[PDB]
Design a protein that fits this description.
The structure is a homodimer of 67-residue chains. With 67 residues, chain A is mainly β. Chain A is built from no helices and five strands. Chains A, B: Affects cell viability at low temperatures. Chains A, B: GO terms for molecular function: DNA binding.
């Protein structure tokens, strides 16, 4: 796992980027968002996630909102 | 994105394998399952999925139960 903050998230398109502690921004698709809530994220929201390597490069998997 | 069928899934533990015609089985964790509803899958279930490579190797992402 890794911790980061949502840089931006567009809930109409369903994706955004997560800014991380010392590395490139990580892409985040709505399909990775955990929880029963609507699968959206807010700019600035802290999230815990795992970095996975998808066919277009790095991606967020298992994205959870931290309290 | 591609289709496959659930080979087996352990409901208590929340993981299983997707069998792909002509290819290798793909590990699937409950966290990748899309939809509203309890995150589980039955053997024989047709699914669509993406494949990503994490710290543990290849695994399914964006798993949707298909009819």
């Amino acid at each position: 796992m890794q911790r980061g903050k949502v840089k931006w998230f567009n809930n109409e398109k369903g994706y955004g980027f997560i800014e991380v502690e010392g590395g490139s921004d990580v892409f985040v698709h709505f399909t990775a968002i955990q929880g029963e809530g609507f699968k959206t994220l807010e700019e600035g929201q802290e999230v815990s996630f795992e970095i996975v390597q998808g066919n277009r490069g790095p991606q967020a998997a298992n994205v959870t909102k931290e309290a």
